[PDB]
Design a protein around this ligand. Structure first.
Ligand SMILES: [Mg+2]
Ligand SMILES: [Mg+2]
Ligand SMILES: [Mg+2]
Ligand SMILES: [Mg+2]
Ligand SMILES: [Mg+2]
Ligand SMILES: [Mg+2]
Ligand SMILES: [Mg+2]
Ligand SMILES: [Mg+2]
Ligand SMILES: [Mg+2]
Ligand SMILES: [Mg+2]
Ligand SMILES: [Mg+2]
Ligand SMILES: [Mg+2]
Ligand SMILES: [Mg+2]
Ligand SMILES: [Mg+2]
Ligand SMILES: [Mg+2]
Ligand SMILES: [Mg+2]
Ligand SMILES: [Mg+2]
Ligand SMILES: [Mg+2]
Ligand SMILES: [Mg+2]
Ligand SMILES: [Mg+2]
Ligand SMILES: [Mg+2]
Ligand SMILES: [Mg+2]
Ligand SMILES: [Mg+2]
Ligand SMILES: [Mg+2]
Ligand SMILES: [Mg+2]
Ligand SMILES: [Mg+2]
Ligand SMILES: [Mg+2]
Ligand SMILES: [Mg+2]
Ligand SMILES: [Mg+2]
Ligand SMILES: [Mg+2]
Ligand SMILES: [Mg+2]
Ligand SMILES: [Mg+2]
Ligand SMILES: [Mg+2]
Ligand SMILES: [Mg+2]
Ligand SMILES: [Mg+2]
Ligand SMILES: [Mg+2]
Ligand SMILES: [Mg+2]
Ligand SMILES: [Mg+2]
Ligand SMILES: [Mg+2]
Ligand SMILES: [Mg+2]
Ligand SMILES: [Mg+2]
Ligand SMILES: [Mg+2]
Ligand SMILES: [Mg+2]
Ligand SMILES: [Mg+2]
Ligand SMILES: [Mg+2]
Ligand SMILES: [Mg+2]
Ligand SMILES: [Mg+2]
Ligand SMILES: [Mg+2]
Ligand SMILES: [Mg+2]
Ligand SMILES: [Mg+2]
Ligand SMILES: [Mg+2]
Ligand SMILES: [Mg+2]
Ligand SMILES: [Mg+2]
Ligand SMILES: [Mg+2]
Ligand SMILES: [Mg+2]
Ligand SMILES: [Mg+2]
Lengths: 92, 76, 106, 127, 99
RNA sequence: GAGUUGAAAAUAAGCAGAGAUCCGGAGAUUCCCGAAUAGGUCAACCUUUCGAACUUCUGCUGAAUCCAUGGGCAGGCAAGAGACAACCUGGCGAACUGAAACAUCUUAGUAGCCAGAGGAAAAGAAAGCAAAAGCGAUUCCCGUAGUAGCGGCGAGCGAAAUGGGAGCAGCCUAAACCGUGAAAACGGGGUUGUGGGAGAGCAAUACAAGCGUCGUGCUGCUAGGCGAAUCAGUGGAGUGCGGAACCCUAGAUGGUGAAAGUCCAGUAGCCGAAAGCAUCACUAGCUUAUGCUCUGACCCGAGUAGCAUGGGGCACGUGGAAUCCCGUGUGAAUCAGCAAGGACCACCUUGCAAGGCUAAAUACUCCUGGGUGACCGAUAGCGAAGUAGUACCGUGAGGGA
RNA sequence: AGUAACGCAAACAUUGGUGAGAAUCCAAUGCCCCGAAAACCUAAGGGUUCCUCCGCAAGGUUCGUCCACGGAGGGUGAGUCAGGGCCUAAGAUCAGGCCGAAAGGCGUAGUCGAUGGACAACAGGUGAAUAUUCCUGUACUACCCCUUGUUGGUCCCGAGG
RNA sequence: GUAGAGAAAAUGCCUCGAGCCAAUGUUCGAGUACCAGGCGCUACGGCGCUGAAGUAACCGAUGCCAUACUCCCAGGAAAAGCUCGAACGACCUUCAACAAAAGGGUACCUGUACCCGAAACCGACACAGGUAGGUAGGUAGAGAAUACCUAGGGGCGCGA
């Protein structure tokens, strides 16, 4: 019942990434890029996106940068579309 | 430790004086002994360590008076 | 001094087999940032002088200023309140100049 | 900029502020300096150095460089600052500059006035 | 102006109204963090408007517990347990925009 | 009390006489490591049953073993832990050196290490100094005095009383006995030295002394406000110069294009505190508390003092070696007594050990506020006037621009 | 003193291009060297040197348009690989306990501690910089749900391995 | 399977059992996937179609079967996972627990860049040096020596 750690769930997602490679990844993989907290997990991020936008998450992959900042690859299920969700935010 | 829990007795600094008045340090230790001491109230022995000078106190004043002055309960 | 300056203590390089002048500590007076040889310290400059000498020196000084001195009457009642303007006017009427030095003993 | 001329900071990382005797828009008169004997309204205040900028006084020609490649620069004339101790409040209906005082009114609001003439400076609702 | 009236309204609300209102802000800040990334028309003052409005609520929530006699050690436990049973939801701004 | 969102401009948006920014008092939050303390760990991370570990406190339960002990369970913003420049206390305790060598000796009970604690600490209310006259707790300074003495009588070490000042404060217990208890123990009683208590019998015992929690004011500190008096000319700038005026309970400082009593901030002087702290005063009411005869009956802090032996330390190196403090082994007396007065005996004088607490004068500066320098002015002064204990070097301690 | 030296005796050469400027940068052709390496992975360690664009003050033992240099931005994707969430050796700590001027020392269970044991994945493709990590296809491990049956199990403990 | 302190185990006794051991191999995975070559385009990068054959014999490992066997003296870790099972003791419970097949669904933390027989680690240097382990081609050859070559990487950072 307990999570791994305890902190602000609304801080798990700071902001997305806007790069020519990231935008290229949305159309090919149906994925999304998000900078995340260092203390975050794949479970909290999976639960997070399920609540904000109301969409299913096929898989989550993460990594820690050299600067101590964690990044999160989020692949949505094929039923939904990351490009459609992208336009809802404002970024293409 | 080489301290007597009852009387607080301990060793002291002492020098060994030669005929040439040369002085090397040494310690005059205490005549401590491991013994079983009888306790009339519970009617049983007690294992502990004290000096021979403290034995004469229990022999004179009794055990219950000596241990109380030190501030220790016999039941451990 | 070289003992109070921070650092030093260690011998930097050995006494021999080095083509350079011997050394005992980097914080030596013969190197910058080092000690001070016979520098000043907090001193008690106070000396003693006999009373009758100090009293005699004070008497003969006043006995020399007789030609440039005089006497006045009391004026404590003439100042019901403090006022530097009236005090200066009194010195002008007595023959003084506020520009120069002066002395009132009472 | 020179590293030691930075404004001194309090322990709370904030600068140490001075007390002034002027405001924005007050008409003044220069006591001494190059613009001595001129009147103008104060535009801005710099509390950290007690300097003030008045319109059309103490100006200097700046050679603006051409940040853009499509055109060249120009020579703009920009206004500089003056230390507030070299100016004095000024009244138009008397043409006499004097120092500043303070007096409480009947309403209970503290205000300042001109010592020599006697007018009020900080009239209400002026900003 | 938004200081005497802002605090007065919050001191009348119950704890549950204060709790759920904070959840709206924490999710509402996320939308502002999105607009900052998209370089859309966003007010930088809203970051301070909302961030300060949270502290005023947790401030009053603490003060109400002072009346009950709660210590510092106990209050942190209840603060964590409230975060253990937390659940994310969409903010109102997403619902008005999602169509 | 008018402009602001640090250094730090610029940009983009806000707050603000419906009184912001800012300045003080009391509070809130205070992520991870770190005494770290849920468990583990390669400090700032991991796993988690989600927990202040352990000791202490308050309860419950009750191994060998009857009472107990040890465990076990639970409660409890739950006392303690660690940090802290120097000074202070305690414990361990050097060597180079000096003696022109060196062991007794000196360096030295210093340095350093460990432990502990406070704003001071420690000491401290005579089993004391003194000498035939008197002083009346402890501590510090002057002086006695480099004297008396100690010392391979070598180097060197070094008092005390009398006297003069700073600063002054004295109190609480054990015991006899009376009640309560199987005892342990609780309460009352009592606390002194030209001896005092208990004991009995007389008296009259305690108002004016010392305390003093509700709190109430006084005075200061922690933000501030009022605050007098100058014009022109001198060619970058005038505070200087020349000329003419003014204030002063304000000619202390700093700043201002160039040196200022009269330009700015200020100073003299005056005013001012919701809240908090401190120094004082007042106030509960329980509070410690006052004297004469009778008795040489009962008590005066015991494995203590003293002695023998082995040592230490007292200015004093075993010396005639007391006084003070310890190890071993022995081992008294209770005012008709005991100790001390530099072996010891006698007489006299002084004092009452073996229980404890106690302010001030005194020592120190990682620091705070104010003030002053025949102190330095970038090779100086703190190592460091810039991201200095940084850069750099070293496995590390550590060194260090 | 404009002296010595410019770090092996594997070897460079031409054409063309870039550019203010080329023995030194790029490409092409030919020649030559290593080839149980002077080749490709990988552990420790280093800690952004990796990729792109721009630049050439200093740094490179010459030059420089280039660079492991400078500036800006970007880059490391795992249920199956490695380690931890499992085990233990050497050894280090150690509840209590013993000893000891202090600090602390010895020491029982227990706990830490891989250099070991235990435990589930490959091929191909994509490509400025990553992939057994992403995509495709085909598998594996653990847990849960579902369907019947059983209806006392789970630790401790004993033994095998 | 059975007896004894006696479930399992161990020991003793009785009994069934000619077959067992595992690298390799067969088949699916395995598609006209991959591929030489060819047909066209170009900014020359690759793109877009097409894409035949895809077998056998010999040599043969320092690798696998393999803690397989033989011999010898110096006599060759521990714990857990796993498996079997009674009693005592503890916890929990009629599914809410154990167990079997298929199907379906779900899936923690850190490292992952780059160099690594080196110009990036260790040697104060872009230093003729040191740096564990893995992969091990062709001709001659006993050979991982040696000589010349493949893949691939280089021509050694002053020159004439
Ligand atoms: Mg990962
Ligand atoms: Mg000696
Ligand atoms: Mg020194
Ligand atoms: Mg030394
Ligand atoms: Mg110096
Ligand atoms: Mg911990
Ligand atoms: Mg710990
Ligand atoms: Mg506490
Ligand atoms: Mg401590
Ligand atoms: Mg010596
Ligand atoms: Mg000597
Ligand atoms: Mg000598
Ligand atoms: Mg302290
Ligand atoms: Mg004080
Ligand atoms: Mg004092
Ligand atoms: Mg004391
Ligand atoms: Mg004391
Ligand atoms: Mg009593
Ligand atoms: Mg003034
Ligand atoms: Mg002038
Ligand atoms: Mg004043
Ligand atoms: Mg006595
Ligand atoms: Mg003696
Ligand atoms: Mg004696
Ligand atoms: Mg005598
Ligand atoms: Mg006496
Ligand atoms: Mg210096
Ligand atoms: Mg100079
Ligand atoms: Mg020559
Ligand atoms: Mg030559
Ligand atoms: Mg050379
Ligand atoms: Mg040459
Ligand atoms: Mg060769
Ligand atoms: Mg590169
Ligand atoms: Mg260059
Ligand atoms: Mg060059
Ligand atoms: Mg670079
Ligand atoms: Mg694995
Ligand atoms: Mg222990
Ligand atoms: Mg052990
Ligand atoms: Mg273990
Ligand atoms: Mg391993
Ligand atoms: Mg694993
Ligand atoms: Mg690569
Ligand atoms: Mg059996
Ligand atoms: Mg990788
Ligand atoms: Mg790689
Ligand atoms: Mg190697
Ligand atoms: Mg090499
Ligand atoms: Mg070298
Ligand atoms: Mg070969
Ligand atoms: Mg070879
Ligand atoms: Mg060759
Ligand atoms: Mg070359
Ligand atoms: Mg080279
Ligand atoms: Mg070379």
């Amino acid at each position: 019942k307990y999570p791994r750690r305890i902190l602000d769930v609304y801080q798990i997602l700071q902001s997305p990434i806007i790069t020519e490679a990231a935008i290229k990844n949305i159309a090919d993989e149906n994925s999304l890029l998000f900078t995340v907290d260092v203390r975050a997990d794949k479970k909290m991020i999976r639960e997070a996106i399920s609540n904000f936008f109301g969409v299913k998450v096929r898989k989550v992959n993460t990594l820690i940068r050299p600067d101590g900042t964690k990044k999160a690859y989020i692949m949505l299920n094929k039923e939904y579309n990351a490009s459609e969700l992208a336009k809802k935010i404002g970024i293409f | 430790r080489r301290i007597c829990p009852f009387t607080g007795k301990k060793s002291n600094k002492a020098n060994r004086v030669s005929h040439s008045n040369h002085k090397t340090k040494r310690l005059q230790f205490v005549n401590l002994q491991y013994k079983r001491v009888w306790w009339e109230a519970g009617k049983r022995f007690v294992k502990l360590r004290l000096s021979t000078k403290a034995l004469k106190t229990i022999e004179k004043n009794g055990l219950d008076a000596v241990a109380k002055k030190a501030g220790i309960d016999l039941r451990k | 001094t070289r003992a109070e300056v921070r650092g030093g203590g260690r011998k930097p390089y050995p006494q021999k087999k080095t083509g350079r002048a011997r050394r005992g500590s980097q914080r030596s007076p013969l190197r910058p940032g080092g000690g001070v040889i016979f520098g000043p310290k907090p001193r008690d400059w106070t000396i003693k002088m006999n009373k009758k000498e100090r009293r005699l020196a004070l008497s003969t000084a006043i006995a020399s200023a007789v030609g440039n001195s005089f006497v006045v009457e009391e004026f404590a009642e003439n100042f019901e309140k403090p006022k530097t303007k009236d005090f200066i006017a009194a010195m002008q009427r007595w023959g003084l100049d506020p520009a120069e030095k002066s002395l009132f003993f009472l | 900029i020179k590293r030691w001329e930075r404004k001194d900071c309090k322990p709370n990382s904030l600068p140490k502020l001075h007390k002034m005797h002027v405001k924005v828009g007050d008409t003044v008169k220069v006591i001494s300096g190059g613009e001595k004997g001129k009147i103008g309204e104060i535009s801005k205040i710099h509390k950290h150095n007690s300097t003030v900028i008045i319109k059309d006084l103490n100006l200097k020609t700046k050679h603006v460089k051409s940040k853009e490649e499509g055109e060249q620069g120009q020579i703009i004339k920009i206004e500089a600052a003056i230390h507030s101790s070299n100016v004095m409040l000024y009244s138009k209906e008397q043409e006499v500059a004097s120092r500043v005082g303070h007096k409480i009114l009947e309403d209970g609001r503290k205000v300042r006035y001109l010592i020599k003439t006697g007018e009020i400076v900080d009239t209400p609702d002026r900003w | 102006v938004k200081k005497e009236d802002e605090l007065k309204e919050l001191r009348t609300k119950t704890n549950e109204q204060l709790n759920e209102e904070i959840l709206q802000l924490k999710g509402e800040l996320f939308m502002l963090r999105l607009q900052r990334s998209a370089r859309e028309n966003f007010k930088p003052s809203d970051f301070g408007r909302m961030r300060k409005r949270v502290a005023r609520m947790l401030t009053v929530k603490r003060e109400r517990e002072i009346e009950q006699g709660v210590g510092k050690r106990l209050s942190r436990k209840l603060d964590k347990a409230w975060k253990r049973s937390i659940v994310v939801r969409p903010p109102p701004s997403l619902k008005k925009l999602q169509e």
